[PDB]
Design a protein around this motif. Structure first.
Motif, short mmCIF file in Angstrom:
data_model
loop_
_atom_site.label_atom_id
_atom_site.label_comp_id
_atom_site.label_asym_id
_atom_site.label_seq_id
_atom_site.Cartn_x
_atom_site.Cartn_y
_atom_site.Cartn_z
N UNK A 70 58.47 32.63 12.74
CA UNK A 70 58.08 31.19 13.17
C UNK A 70 56.98 30.94 14.13
N UNK A 71 56.19 30.05 14.20
CA UNK A 71 55.38 29.47 15.20
C UNK A 71 55.40 27.97 14.88
N UNK A 72 56.41 27.27 15.44
CA UNK A 72 56.48 25.95 15.28
C UNK A 72 55.88 25.21 16.29
#
Lengths: 49, 49
Positions: free
Chosen positions: B20-22
């Motif tokens: 993830x890279x939210x």
């Protein structure tokens, strides 16, 4: 060849062996430059060129 | 590594292995350009430059 003789009797000397190139007359030539007739120079431009 | 499973019973598929890279919040920065105050531009020069 250049040679030379000194005469002790008359305190003089002659140098021989030279060849002449004597100006005897004249040739006349007409040299021309074609010019432009320029009156006023019309510009309000203050441009440096 | 990416892997994937197909479920025949429900006509669907899941692809796993991703990280993830939210985006969760915001950072605010002020970017500035320094300007010159220029009123009239004083010249009668018709110079091209």
């Amino acid at each position: 060849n250049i040679t030379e003789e000194f005469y002790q009797s008359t305190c003089s000397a002659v140098s021989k062996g030279y060849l002449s190139a004597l100006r005897t007359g004249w040739y006349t030539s007409v040299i021309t430059i074609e010019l432009s007739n320029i009156k006023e120079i019309k510009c309000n431009g203050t441009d440096a060129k």
